[PDB]
Design a protein around this ligand. Structure first.
Ligand SMILES: Nc1ncnc2c1ncn2[C@@H]1O[C@H](COP(=O)(O)O)[C@@H](O)[C@H]1O
Ligand SMILES: [Mg+2]
Length: 330
C-alpha cells in the first residue's frame, strides 16, 4: 500500500493525481472526508468496487455511498430526482448529507447491493472533492474500517486497519466531524435513515414532513448512562466489582479521578465529542478493563448523531434508572 501524505486544506494536486490514477485503473484508495475516512473505487467499475468489500470483509449486501464532485455526475448515477430535491441538493452540497435516490443503469450491483436505489453525497473536504475531480468518475465508498472496528477518523486508524489490503491510503489528518453523514431517503414521501452532522433541526426546515443483529465495536462491554443524575452512583456501584473505564467530558474528570478515563471532549462543544467518539471506542478495547461506562449527551444538533452511534456501540445497554444496571451486569 502506498501511503501518501496530503494537506487536507490545500491538497497538492500532483499527489492527488497519483491516487486518482489508481482509481481510474480500478484500484482502491482510502481518503479523508468531513465525516469519516472512506475506502473508494470507481463507482462505475463493479469489479473494482468488490475490492472494497474484500479489503473490509464487508457483507456483500451492505451498499456503498457514491461520492460526486459536481452535479453533472449526480445525473450519471441518479435519475427521476424531484425538483425540490435538486433545488435543496444545490444548497447543501458539498456537505455531510446523503440522499437515497433512484439509480441509473450505470450503477453496478456491487454499489447498490442490487437495490433499485443509490445513496449519493458530495463530500465537503478538499482532498475528497479533488480526488473525485481528478479521477473523472464518481467514487463509491463506505467507511474505511475493517468490518468489526469503529469508523476511522484519522490516518492511523486506516493504516492499522487496511495497510496491505488496499492500493493507496491518503494520510490527510483527522476528519472534521467524526461521525458519518446524515442519510435521508427521498424516493418515498422523506425518511431519516441515519442522523449525522447535518442536523435534524436543519433538515426539518427543508423537509418539514420528514419522518424520524450486527455487532458494533467496541468488543468490550459498554454501558450508556443517559440519565446524568445517576452517573456517579452507577460508577460507584460498578467500579466496586469491576475494573472500569469512563467515557466522559472533561468537565467530569475531577469527579472520578483515580479511575480509568477516556476524555471525549467538552460539554460546551459537542462537535469535539463527535470528533473523538469512534477513537474513544478503539481506546476502550486497547485498555484492559471489564467494561466501559459512557455518560449521555444532549440530543441537540450533532448530539443526536453522537447518541445514535453510542446506543449502537453499547449494544443498546441504556441506563435511565440505576436499577437498569441489573440488566447488563452482575
Ligand atoms: N440505497 C440505499 N438505501 C439505504 N441506505 C443505503 C443505501 N445505500 C447505502 N446506504 C447506507 O450507506 C451505508 C454505507 O456507507 P457507510 O455507513 O459510510 O459504511 C450502508 O450501510 C447503508 O446504511
Ligand atoms: Mg461503515
Amino acid at each position: 500500500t502506498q501511503i501518501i501524505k496530503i494537506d487536507p486544506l490545500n491538497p497538492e494536486i500532483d499527489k492527488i493525481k497519483i491516487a486518482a490514477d489508481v482509481i481510474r485503473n480500478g484500484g482502491t484508495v482510502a481518503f479523508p472526508t468531513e465525516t469519516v475516512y472512506g475506502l473508494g473505487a470507481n463507482a462505475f467499475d463493479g469489479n473494482a468496487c468488490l475490492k472494497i468489500f474484500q479489503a473490509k470483509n464487508r457483507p456483500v449486501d451492505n451498499p456503498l455511498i457514491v461520492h460526486i464532485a459536481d452535479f453533472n455526475q449526480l445525473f450519471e448515477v441518479a435519475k427521476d430526482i424531484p425538483d425540490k430535491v435538486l433545488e435543496i441538493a444545490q444548497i447543501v452540497w458539498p456537505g455531510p448529507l446523503t440522499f437515497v435516490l433512484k439509480k441509473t443503469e450505470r450503477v453496478p450491483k456491487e454499489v447498490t447491493a442490487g437495490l433499485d436505489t443509490v445513496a449519493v453525497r458530495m463530500p465537503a473536504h478538499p482532498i475528497a472533492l479533488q480526488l473525485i475531480r481528478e479521477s473523472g468518475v464518481p467514487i463509491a465508498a463506505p467507511s474505511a474500517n475493517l468490518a468489526t472496528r469503529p469508523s476511522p477518523t484519522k490516518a492511523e486508524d486506516v493504516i492499522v486497519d487496511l495497510n496491505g489490503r488496499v492500493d493507496v491510503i491518503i494520510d490527510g489528518g483527522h476528519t472534521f466531524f467524526g461521525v458519518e453523514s446524515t442519510i435521508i431517503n427521498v424516493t418515498v414521501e422523506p425518511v431519516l435513515l441515519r442522523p449525522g452532522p447535518f442536523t435534524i433541526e436543519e433538515l426539518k426546515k427543508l423537509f418539514g414532513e420528514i419522518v424520524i443483529y450486527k455487532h458494533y465495536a467496541p468488543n468490550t462491554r459498554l454501558l450508556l448512562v443517559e440519565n446524568r443524575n445517576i452517573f456517579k452512583d452507577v460508577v460507584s456501584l460498578l467500579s466496586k466489582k469491576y475494573k472500569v473505564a469512563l467515557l466522559i467530558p472533561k468537565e467530569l474528570s475531577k469527579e472520578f479521578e483515580g479511575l480509568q478515563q477516556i476524555i471525549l471532549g467538552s460539554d460546551e462543544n459537542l462537535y469535539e465529542v463527535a470528533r473523538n467518539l469512534f477513537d474513544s471506542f478503539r481506546e476502550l478495547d486497547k485498555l484492559n478493563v471489564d467494561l466501559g461506562i459512557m455518560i449521555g449527551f444532549p440530543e441537540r444538533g450533532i448530539g443526536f448523531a453522537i447518541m445514535n452511534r453510542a446506543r449502537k456501540a453499547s449494544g443498546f445497554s441504556i441506563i435511565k434508572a440505576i436499577s437498569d444496571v441489573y440488566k447488563y451486569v452482575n
